């Protein structure tokens, strides 16, 4: 019914550089966007309800198009899962953007 995809499903950027991870979506009346970071075992909340977490507030900026980082460390390497859900949860979509800090 709806579409959730990324322009760059794999992103390789050098250390201490900015980066935007793009989340493209369509078919939603009123959507809710969520960004989760997975590095091996640890899962981290980045963005929830079109709002950035306290642990990522200082360097990440949200836009419907995606999440823009000011700088990236060796720490930030891993998968960034973007979930878009319709209010009332009748429709929802996922997309994974692999980030490789060089």
């Amino acid at each position: 019914s709806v579409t959730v995809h990324s322009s760059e499903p794999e992103v390789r950027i050098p250390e201490n550089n900015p980066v935007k991870l793009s989340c493209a979506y369509s078919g939603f009346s009123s959507p809710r966007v969520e960004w989760k970071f997975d590095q091996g075992d640890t899962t981290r909340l980045v963005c929830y309800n079109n709002k950035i977490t306290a642990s990522y507030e200082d360097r990440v900026t949200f836009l419907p198009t995606g999440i823009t980082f000011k700088s990236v460390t060796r720490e930030d390497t891993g998968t960034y899962t973007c979930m878009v859900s319709e209010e009332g949860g009748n429709s929802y979509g996922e997309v994974k953007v692999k980030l490789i800090v060089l």
Binding site: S29, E34, K36, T43, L45, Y48, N49, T53, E87, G89
Partner: protein, 162 residues
């Protein structure tokens, strides 16, 4: 003409415009580890709780469980970041305010000591939500020394928005 926004819907075949029936009911399930936290004792138990979105309320339905010993005080942590149902976002568990407590229910417990099962009560309050982590403060209630805790089913709800 106006479009509408959930909960306000529009029925095509009837020129309807009614409050969705799912507004008063939206099921889900968090499957994870219930974290008990205290400075001298901490443990984690595999629980699978049911969730219900009822208007602007989020209800958690705890099933009966047997856990390790607990101290007179304590905290219960629920990490919503992972474990939620299909189509459920960690943001779907965010409370609508920061007032402490939001709500305070009681849990019927049996403090399992020797062969004995000592009936007691535990006041639980909804206090914090931090980047997907819910914190339920066990302020106290009747207590005795025990080697285990059997918990009867229980419910806590707190205000929330969708």
């Amino acid at each position: 003409l106006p479009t509408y926004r959930y909960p306000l819907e529009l029925d095509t075949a009837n020129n309807r415009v009614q409050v969705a029936d799912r507004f008063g009911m939206r099921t889900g399930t968090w499957t994870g580890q219930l974290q008990y936290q205290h400075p001298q004792l901490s443990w984690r138990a595999n629980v699978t709780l049911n969730l219900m979105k009822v208007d602007d309320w989020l209800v958690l339905s705890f099933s009966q469980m047997t856990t390790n010993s607990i101290m007179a005080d304590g905290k219960f942590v629920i990490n919503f970041v992972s474990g939620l149902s299909s189509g459920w976002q960690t943001g779907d568990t965010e409370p609508s305010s920061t007032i402490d407590p939001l709500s305070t229910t009681f849990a019927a417990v049996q403090f399992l000591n020797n062969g004995q099962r000592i009936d007691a009560f535990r006041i639980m309050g909804v206090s914090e939500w931090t980047d997907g982590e819910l914190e339920i403060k066990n302020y106290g209630g009747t207590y005795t020394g025990h080697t285990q805790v059997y918990w009867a089913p229980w419910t806590i709800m707190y205000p929330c928005n969708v």
